[PDB]
Amino acid sequence: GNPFSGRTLLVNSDYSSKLDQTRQAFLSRGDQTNAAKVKYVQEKVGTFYWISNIFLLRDIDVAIQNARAAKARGENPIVGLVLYNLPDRDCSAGESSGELKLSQNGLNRYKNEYVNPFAQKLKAASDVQFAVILEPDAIGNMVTGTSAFCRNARGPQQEAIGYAISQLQASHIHLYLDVANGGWLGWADKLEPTAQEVATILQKAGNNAKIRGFSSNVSNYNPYSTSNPPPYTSGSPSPDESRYATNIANAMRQRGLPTQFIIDQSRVALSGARSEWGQWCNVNPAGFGQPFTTNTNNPNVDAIVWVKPGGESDGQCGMGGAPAAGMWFDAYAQMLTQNAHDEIA
Amino acid sequence: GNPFSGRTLLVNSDYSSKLDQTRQAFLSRGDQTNAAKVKYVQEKVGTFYWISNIFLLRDIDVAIQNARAAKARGENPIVGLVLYNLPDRDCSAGESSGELKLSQNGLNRYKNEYVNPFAQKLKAASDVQFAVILEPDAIGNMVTGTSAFCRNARGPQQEAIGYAISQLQASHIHLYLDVANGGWLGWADKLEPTAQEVATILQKAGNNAKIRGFSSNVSNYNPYSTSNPPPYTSGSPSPDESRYATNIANAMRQRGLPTQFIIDQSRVALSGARSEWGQWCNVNPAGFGQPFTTNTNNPNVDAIVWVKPGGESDGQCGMGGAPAAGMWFDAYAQMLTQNAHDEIA
User: Fold this and answer.
1) Residue A288 sits in which domain range?
2) What's the CA gap between B99 and B241, in Å, rounded?
3) Cβ under 8 Å to A: B residues 7-46
4) How many secondary structure helices (H) and strands (E) does chain B include?
5) What is the CATH number of the domain that holds B32?
6) Among A24, A113, A336, B175, fewest CB within 10 Å belongs to which?
């Protein structure tokens, strides 16, 4: 069954605290309507916690503590975590986007100094339900990346992700392998290749290794369901994320693999924001998307979630004034609030 | 005594490895002249090692290994290390640029998880000489930082730096407290406020605590000595780093504090590279500056060193094609080579 059914996605306390700056900035201009929308996100919108380096393994203990505090106040939470520290991470850029590199004993450090401790903390926390998104966009780079750097990282990255899955096999841990977004892998010629990559990684994870399914649109901006997708989606069978999810599940079902998705809607672009589907860095204009829900109107979509913490920069690119990746970008957080989904108030 | 006297600044092996890409690029266009200049930097030009987070404490072991291997083939090295993990680091941007935040128990984590281990490794290696640059731009942010965020961090940051000085007192450890660059703190109305900050920090490190002096121009592009400084230096008594060093040393002397500088010349801006002195991101055109030497022609300047590794990006800014901070930017590395100081050949 769906692990989110009857649960609340836990609020990310780091994100919530950083959003206090946004609440305060709206208050300094007498903008009470937007200040209150920020406070709603602070208190009621669950977001995944990104464990983007080895130092941030301590945030797993913060999330656990918060999942015990919440369920003690009467709630029934599920903690979203992002496992994201692959050696030669985001190989498309030509060099790891993170601290581990394959040429610096990265595969071993990932297994032993990153995955092992991550898996240990989740296992000691048997009372807590976890949804873990595994390595955003690694599969996309594997399927389509043609540079030597990406071509050299592919094997070791499949071993690393298979290792991760093999170490996170418990009843309270629900694994969602990332599959990028409909604009990257949802084209007719990319669905089958994506499914093949999943089978290869699952073979490496072990015979009895399972995953619940996949994640998509993490840190991206595609709509979940629309009858008016952008013109750049012309020719694609996956013009929104609900359809992308159904198309991947269809390829997965034919191979006997998992079919379920969680779809990020932390940020959704307004019509016309991107001229090209591949644009990804601090896209504007955009707005906060629909907050966490199991009411998805798609049997292969377990839940709509927030994974990227909107307001954390994607890098010094896109919207002007953008700080380095992961740094707080208050004016962007303000824009997302101004254009926020109607549920937020 | 000047700690660099009769010593060679140790090559940074990680940086030298990354430069191989540059050497390969020049070779691939038949440019032997610049390929040879890259190899000159790879084998003969010392660069500091940046210990920019807790994960990178392992690079101190790397540097010490290299120092002991150098001394085994008859050399007399001095290892440059950059101690750079202050809580709420680079406060003027509004959020720590590093992993430690004051509101996340950052002061305690800085002492116990970063300074202590740093000190343990250097005090164990009593056979190695070290030049440690302490917290680049922290004093700059303390003197001119009037935002609420910096003002809130001031107290604890002074205690943090004093703590780092207090833990690194040894005859083989030579401390240089960073004082930004002449464009920031070299103005007339800024020299005393800078000396006052150093006096306050040294009091907090204690009565018996000492530093050898200061570092400047780290990651910047100001020339060491020129009779033709850029127009934007008009009205400044510190229009080159040699004059900045003398001005600070004179202010310190009158308060009876240390005076000695080490000045980065890893990258030097060429004519017209900047229209404003505060420009800092991947400034171009620029060249590799003068390699390490103690022939400084200035009593207040212990040595010209390379601290920032030229070719590592400052951020996704300044020059087309720039990657995120710390990512290798090979076209920039080729530029620094073609415009290198005449010693490099």
Assistant:
1) 1-345
2) 31
3) none
4) 11, 10
5) 3.20.20.40
6) A24
